Amino acid sequence: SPGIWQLDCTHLEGKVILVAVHVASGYIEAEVIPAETGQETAYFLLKLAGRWPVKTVHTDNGSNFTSTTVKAACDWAGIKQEDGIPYNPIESMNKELKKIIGQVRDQAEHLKTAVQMAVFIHNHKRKGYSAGERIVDIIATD
Amino acid sequence: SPGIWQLDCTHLEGKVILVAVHVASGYIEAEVIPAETGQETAYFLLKLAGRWPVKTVHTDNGSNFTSTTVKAACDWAGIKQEIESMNKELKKIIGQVRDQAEHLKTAVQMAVFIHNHKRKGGIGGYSAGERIVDIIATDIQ
Amino acid sequence: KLDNXX
Ligand SMILES: [Cl-]
Ligand SMILES: [Cl-]
Secondary structure, three states, X not given: OOOEEEEEEEEEOOEEEEEEEEOOOOEEEEEEEOOOOHHHHHHHHHHHHHHOOOOEEEEOOOHHHHOHHHHHHHHHOOOEEXXXXXOOOOHHHHHXXXXXXXXXXXXXXXXXXXXXXXXXXXXXXXXXXXXXXXXXXXXXXX | OOOEEEEEEEEEOOEEEEEEEEOOOOEEEEEEEXXXXXXXXXXXXXXXXXXXXXXXXXXXXOHHHHOHHHHHHHHHHOOEOOXXXXXXXXXXXXXXHHHHOOOHHHHHHHHHHHHHHOXXXXXXXEOHHHHHHHHHHHHHO | OOXXXX
């Protein structure tokens, strides 16, 4: 289904990376944030929603998602929040993203740059179509 | 032409908004940064390139685009360095929602959302976010 | 206000 995303967090070098996965395509977007707060999480989701037509987000039900800033953001953007609901068979994608980050880490002075290089690699990898090609094909309305 | 973008700066409240416009669609992305630095520019371009198939970026030629860190980012991502209304439109939306946010950055991203999702014309029309996705999907196929 | 406000 084209409008369904899953958000996950992963912690590295003592920083936090918020990852949004477009479930149908495996396409990802990611940002390093200083901590898993309501306001940081809200701002991430507002940006994501401005970029793609986001109808539903599955979350881990962390306290950052139960916050009223996140709820305000989701209602403003018309996003339905599904807290603590798995769509079924991820920690692979976290271990994978961290695998790729580990491979490019020596090419960037700062972790945030390495994370973006890793996102680029991930979304462009042919598996035949890339995740980046699949998300657009799935979302296109004509 | 599917891989061409234009990047422009706007100054508001002593902050800088970097605005990337996908030329063929009018779709935008934007970020708010403290100052127009080579580091921030490179970071914005790698984020853009991991999301969309960016081949060419047209810019204002300022010193942020000349830096060795921007050249290293562009080399890595395969980007060649070699719409003014869209920016005035963005600025006007930002003004209209500005008071609904404590921070400039939240108003900027609301305006981005409003801009990319707004249908142009009547029944039969498209939003910029629909146009970009349709342009790229058609190009792949 | 959408963010920290309000
Ligand atoms: Cl999270
Ligand atoms: Cl600029």
